[PDB]
Every structure is written in structure tokens, then in C-alpha cells.
Ligand binder design. Structure first.
Ligand code: FES
Length: 100
């Protein structure tokens, strides 16, 4: 497997869709911000609802998140501040209200 890689992230946001390359060692949130995208957050530590999204295709590593339970992870919930892509992914953002 490659020492380093980047994956195509498609974010489906309330103001439109955007795509960018995310390094496999950068969280979705941080990579979005580098591209000038404003995404919701507060704690940036994987322990709250602020940065919630829904995974629509592809795979994430969310080992660094703790607030979502195993059923919520199975349902496709994502804490964008604590998730790394391991494939190209599509995430629908700004989902805190739906999650909670
Ligand atoms: S901003 Fe709190 S879990 Fe992501």
C-alpha cells in the first residue's frame, strides 16, 4: 500500500457541491478549510455534534472520533473533524440538526 495518498472528497453542502483532494493524513474538516470551504465545528476533537455529516459513498477512518456510537457509525454518520478518507468519499455536510 502507498506510504502516502490523496483521495477525492465531494462535499454536498447546503450552498452547493465542492470537490477537492484530501491527503490520507489530513482530516476532512482541515482539508476543506485549506480549500476555503466553511464547515461547521466547535470542539475539533471528535466529542460533539457540531461537525456531523453523512457518508454517502466510500470509506473513512473514524478511529479518532468518540461521540458517535457504533450504530451511528454503521448508519453512515461522520464527525468531519476526526475522519480521514481511505478512499474517494462523498459526504453530505451540515447534518448536526438531523443527527440530534
Ligand atoms: S467539532 Fe466536535 S466532534 Fe467535530
Amino acid at each position: 500500500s502507498p506510504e502516502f495518498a490523496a483521495y477525492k472528497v465531494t462535499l454536498v453542502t447546503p450552498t452547493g457541491n465542492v470537490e477537492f483532494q484530501c491527503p490520507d493524513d489530513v482530516y476532512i474538516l482541515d482539508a476543506a478549510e485549506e480549500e476555503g470551504i466553511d464547515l461547521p465545528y466547535s470542539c475539533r476533537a471528535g466529542s460533539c455534534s457540531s461537525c456531523a455529516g453523512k457518508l454517502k459513498t466510500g470509506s473513512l477512518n473514524q478511529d479518532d472520533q468518540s461521540f458517535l456510537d457504533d450504530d451511528q457509525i454503521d448508519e453512515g454518520w461522520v464527525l468531519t473533524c476526526a475522519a480521514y478518507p481511505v478512499s474517494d468519499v462523498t459526504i453530505e455536510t451540515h447534518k448536526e440538526e438531523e443527527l440530534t
